[PDB]
């Protein structure tokens, strides 16, 4: 297999590449948050309706109490995971009735009034794309417990987070929600990644169009890919498969004459029936302990994933993150949470530089026997003239004393070039 | 308040109590006491009874060790998180939202606790917010002025520039604004004067 | 042991019993009259008791998990049948979690759909901003477990003693 396409970067001692354009990229991150809450009746699973089996089972001690306690701990842990990930705001924020945000379209992520479920088109697609087994599992003494937060309330929490991040930016996550116009919020986010406000304000319509196109592409990408929601479906598959295996293990003889306790009672005397019931009890108890052990390991994995999801919700949705690749590929601007069955999907809106151009660069400018260094940018040359520009977008400006600072003479810096510095 | 540490102590004590309690389980044998089994039966059947007790007790001990390993993994994850909070919240100022308290994080103080650490997160919470009329840029002399570090606000009649996280209105000058382009591109630009510091100097 | 309800399943003439996906019986054919019956096992549930502290009151409520209320101050929830609590249309914070959005509290014991939060509508407009004029220095506590009790087990002494 090939690792990647081969790219050789044209490294030289005085050439720099400066971006002249950008792409607003929205990417998806799917994280499992909770599992299916399962409870097992130890006596009913191992022995069913047999009193003699229960009497023999009592000789083994507090195994049943341990398994019930462990399952109860997992069951409360799942609700705690959902509370930690989604219930991070104590105010239910709402969007204004006029959905105008300076050209930005949020129809695919805001709740749809037409739908009875009050879910977004993306959330509705996520619920549709994640899917007598249950009856049999119930009939063998295993019960699925309902999640404490219902899907509509989880959708309501995502709606409140979206309304807070859209109408108030990151202010609602750090205290009271302070209203700010959405272009000004996006300008603040552009300042966070080192791009000036003018770049956002001048190219507002292009940025809004790019964001809308990216959101539409995200919905199409989710609707058109079967393996997009593999993590959540994988968790559902493991839980169902574990319950099916545990139910299937009741049909195992475990080295006894029959797997049916009623047959053992109806066919043998108590001295040997006690032995056969003991064989069935030890096999079924081993199966149940194995199931509880894998449930605990999966609970630890889901707890780690939920802690990661809560960290992404806090740092990507409720603020702007400077951590590289934590909130999408590219310079992170903002993030949008979407509820999904047993999980969360983060739409990471990032800034990707594009259309880079070569320029001749210098560390400092020598003027009047003094070395001038950029305050916030980089010195670039298009061939004949020297300018100073911001590092992440090409905006050439005249080299003046306002945007440069003087430190020392021209004899120490290696690679300093001679150019004029304008005085206002 | 201290439910997590007490919960860990409770789980450890409960696990040891359960493991001790499991010695009183017959495990399908005549008695749970090995001395009675030796004192009452011949070696051919005593070996079987001792085998039943050994397999039950060994299963109990393996179960206890397995849950100890799972709890050890959980406590290791919590300790790694605590070390990360100690490094990023106490030994520096963190810009991660909600990692070191609710609000804008200022500093943190560590306190020792039985089997754990308590972090006192000192954070800055904005309060007493006030409405203002805002504009993206100020149009002066056919040029667009943008704030260097703040935001343009209006109290109704006058325009000022203030820092984003505290209200401190200052006069819009060339020192705190930068010029990029003309007034024809920015959507929502308003007309206001931009003071020049050099103007009284050369005038006088 | 189970209820024998009417079945809509059309068996072939040679088949006598019926099985689930997981090899559990779900249907049977009556040998007296050639009709199909859906064998469904009798109801079972996890009895959970919802109670406040004994310091405050001794009233309790019982939740039968997964059991319809007609097969057992009786209210029907998606979690199961709750007996001993009265449904209130008001929404409060969750005190005792019941499930499926239902929570219980003591005021008698009431059951309600829990409120997620206070409703706040932010006055978003295209040219208005809100600027803080003051601040609060907030100190908050975070409790994190670091270590456990270090345990060692003598395998020979535990299993066999002397
Ligand atoms: C900057 O200039 C360098 C060299 O002048 C360009 O690098 C060349 O790229 C082409 C196309 O991939 C290669 O065939 C050459 O071998 C490269 N030369 C070297 C020396 O690496 C580079 O593409 C230019 N950058 C831009 C944005 O045009
Ligand atoms: C920056 O890139 C954007 C697209 O990412 C360019 O906008 C395109 O402009 C061309 C021609 O002007 C149109 O045909 C396309 O329809 C535009 N695309 C979009 C999405 O609007 C823009 O022109 C680029 N700017 C510079 C200076 O190169
Ligand atoms: C925001 O985007 C939505 C969908 O992305 C736009 O709704 C579309 O409107 C066009 C024209 O009215 C229809 O042909 C499409 O079928 C609509 N799509 C959907 C999914 O309903 C909407 O017009 C955009 N603008 C606003 C202001 O909401
Ligand atoms: C580098 O950029 C400068 C500034 O944009 C260019 O100078 C201008 O070039 C245009 C067209 O060549 C002329 O019409 C202007 O009169 C020039 N301005 C000045 C002040 O001289 C310069 O040509 C660019 N250099 C290269 C090699 O493209
Ligand atoms: C930048 O300017 C300085 C001063 O104008 C140049 O230094 C002079 O270089 C000439 C020829 O190399 C010498 O004869 C002078 O004695 C130098 N004067 C001083 C004060 O050092 C320097 O060469 C220029 N650099 C470039 C790249 O043009
Ligand atoms: C907006 O703020 C400015 C500056 O604080 C106010 O202007 C001053 O108002 C006070 C009392 O109204 C007068 O005594 C000063 O003489 C004013 N200064 C100037 C330079 O005019 C202005 O009144 C405020 N506007 C509103 C609506 O409160
Ligand atoms: C800001 O100032 C500019 C220039 O003083 C105004 O532009 C003029 O507007 C009048 C009436 O709309 C026109 O008759 C002129 O032709 C415009 N001149 C130019 C150079 O554009 C602009 O209207 C002012 N904006 C506000 C909101 O007052
Ligand atoms: C800023 O102004 C807006 C509207 O002028 C205020 O929002 C109003 O708040 C009251 C009190 O909660 C509500 O009854 C109104 O319905 C709100 N109006 C709108 C349009 O949302 C807001 O409170 C003001 N901010 C401050 C800090 O006073
Ligand atoms: C900012 O808030 C502080 C309190 O958080 C205010 O200080 C209070 O001032 C009032 C009246 O001036 C006193 O009665 C209180 O005792 C003060 N509290 C404290 C803790 O000192 C302060 O006045 C506020 N500042 C502004 C400009 O509103
Ligand atoms: C600059 O780079 C070239 C090759 O990239 C190298 O040969 C040259 O020595 C470098 N300049 C200096 C002053 O070392
Ligand atoms: C069984 O016997 C009854 C009584 O004669 C009769 O009505 C019924 O049709 C019989 N069923 C079959 C399958 O022969
Ligand atoms: C400003 O907002 C209002 C409602 O908030 C809207 O009706 C109006 O169209 C917006 N202005 C522009 C220029 O779109």
Curated annotation (Swiss-Prot), chain B:
Glycosylated residues (UniProt): 131, 155, 191
Outcome of substituting residue 39 to A: In strain: Alpha/B.1.1.7
Disulfide bonds: 89-100, 139-183
Documented effect of changing residue 7 to N: In strain: Delta/B.1.617.2, Mu/B.1.621
Result of altering residue 149 to K: In strain: Theta/P.3
Coiled coil residues, start to end: 6-50
Superkingdom classification of source: Viruses
Protein function: Subunit of the fusion protein that is processed upon entry into the host cell. Mediates fusion of the virion and cellular membranes by functioning as a class I viral fusion protein. Contains a viral fusion peptide that is unmasked after S2 cleavage. This cleavage can occur at the cell membrane by host TMPRSS2 or during endocytosis by host CSTL. In either case, this triggers an extensive and irreversible conformational change that leads to fusion of the viral envelope with the cellular cytoplasmic membrane, releasing viral genomic RNA into the host cell cytoplasm.
Protein name per Swiss-Prot or TrEMBL: Spike protein S2'
Organism per entry: Severe acute respiratory syndrome coronavirus 2
Section covered of the full-length record: 944 to 1147 of 1273
């Amino acid at each position: 297999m090939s690792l990647g396409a081969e790219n050789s970067v044209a490294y030289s001692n005085n050439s720099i590449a400066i971006p002249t354009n950008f792409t607003i990229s929205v990417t998806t991150e799917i994280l499992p948050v909770s599992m299916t809450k399962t409870s097992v009746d130890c006596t009913m699973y191992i022995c069913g309706d047999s009193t003699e089996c229960s009497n023999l089972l009592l000789q083994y001690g507090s195994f049943c109490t341990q398994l019930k306690r462990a399952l109860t701990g997992i069951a409360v842990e799942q609700d705690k995971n959902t509370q930690e990930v989604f219930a991070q705001v104590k105010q239910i924020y709402k969007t204004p009735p006029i959905k105008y945000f300076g050209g930005f379209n949020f129809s695919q992520i805001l709740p749809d009034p037409s739908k009875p479920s009050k879910r977004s088109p993306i959330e509705d697609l996520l619920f549709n794309k994640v899917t007598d087994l249950i009856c049999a599992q119930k009939f063998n003494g295993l019960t699925v417990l309902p999640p404490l937060l219902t899907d509509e309330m989880i959708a309501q929490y995502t709606s409140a987070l979206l309304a807070g991040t859209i109408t108030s930016g990151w202010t609602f996550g750090a205290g009271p929600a302070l209203q700010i116009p959405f272009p000004m919020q996006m300008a603040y986010r552009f300042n966070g990644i080192g791009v000036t406000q003018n770049v956002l304000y001048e190219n507002q319509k292009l940025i809004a169009n790019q964001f809308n196109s990216a959101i539409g592409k995200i919905q199409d990408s989710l609707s058109s890919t079967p393996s997009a929601l593999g993590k959540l479906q994988d968790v559902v598959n493991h839980n169902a498969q574990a319950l099916n295996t545990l139910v299937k293990q009741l049909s195992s003889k475990f080295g006894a004459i029959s797997s049916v306790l009623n047959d053992i009672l109806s066919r043998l005397d108590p001295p040997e029936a006690e032995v056969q019931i003991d064989r069935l009890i030890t096999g079924r108890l081993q199966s149940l302990q194995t199931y509880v052990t894998q449930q605990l390991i999966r609970a630890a994995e889901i707890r780690a994933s939920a802690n990661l999801a809560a960290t992404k919700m806090s740092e990507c949705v409720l603020g702007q993150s400077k951590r590289v690749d934590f909130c999408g590929k590219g310079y992170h601007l903002m993030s949008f949470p979407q509820s999904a069955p047993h999980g969360v999907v983060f739409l990471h809106v990032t800034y990707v530089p594009a259309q880079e151009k070569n320029f001749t660069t210098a560390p400092a400018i020598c003027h009047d026997g003094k070395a001038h260094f950029p305050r916030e940018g980089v010195f670039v040359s298009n061939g004949t003239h020297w300018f100073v520009t911001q590092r992440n977008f090409y905006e050439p400006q005249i080299i003046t004393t306002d945007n440069t600072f003087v430190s020392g003479n021209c004899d120490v810096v290696i690679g300093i070039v001679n150019n004029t510095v304008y005085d206002p | 308040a201290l439910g997590k540490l007490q919960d860990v102590v409770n789980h450890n004590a409960q696990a040891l109590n359960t493991l001790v309690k499991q010695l009183s389980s017959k495990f399908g044998a005549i008695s749970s006491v090995l001395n009675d089994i030796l004192s009452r039966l011949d070696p051919p059947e005593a070996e079987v009874q001792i085998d039943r007790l050994i397999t039950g007790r060994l299963q109990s001990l393996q179960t206890y060790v397995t849950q100890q390993l799972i709890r050890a993994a959980e406590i290791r994850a919590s300790a790694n998180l605590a070390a990360t909070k100690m490094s990023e919240c106490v030994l520096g100022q963190s810009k991660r939202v909600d990692f070191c308290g609710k609000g804008y994080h200022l500093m943190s103080f560590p306190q020792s606790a039985p089997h754990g650490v308590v972090f006192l997160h000192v954070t800055y919470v904005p309060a007493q917010e006030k409405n203002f009329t805002t504009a993206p840029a100020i149009c002066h002399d056919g040029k667009a002025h943008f704030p260097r570090e703040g935001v343009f606000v209006s109290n109704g009649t006058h325009w000022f520039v203030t820092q984003r996280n505290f209200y401190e209105p200052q006069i819009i000058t060339t020192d705190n604004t930068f010029v990029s382009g003309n007034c024809d591109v920015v959507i929502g630009i308003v007309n206001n004067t931009v003071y020049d510091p050099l103007q009284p100097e050369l005038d006088s | 042991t189970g209820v024998l309800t009417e079945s809509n399943k059309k068996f072939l003439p040679f088949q006598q019993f019926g099985r689930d996906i997981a090899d559990t019986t779900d249907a049977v054919r009556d040998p007296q009259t050639l009709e199909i019956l859906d064998i469904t096992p009798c109801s079972f549930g996890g009895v959970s008791v919802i109670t406040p502290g004994t310091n405050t009151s001794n009233q309790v409520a019982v939740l039968y998990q997964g059991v319809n209320c007609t097969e057992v101050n009786v209210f029907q929830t998606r979690a199961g049948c709750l007996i001993g609590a009265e449904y209130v249309n008001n929404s409060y914070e969750c005190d005792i979690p019941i499930g499926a959005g239902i929570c219980a509290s003591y005021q008698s014991i009431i059951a309600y759909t829990m409120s997620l939060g206070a409703e706040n509508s932010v006055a978003y407009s295209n040219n208005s901003i809100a600027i803080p004029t003051n601040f609060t220095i907030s100190v908050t506590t975070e409790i994190l477990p670091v270590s456990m009790t270090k345990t060692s087990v003598d395998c020979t002494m535990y299993i066999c003693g002397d």
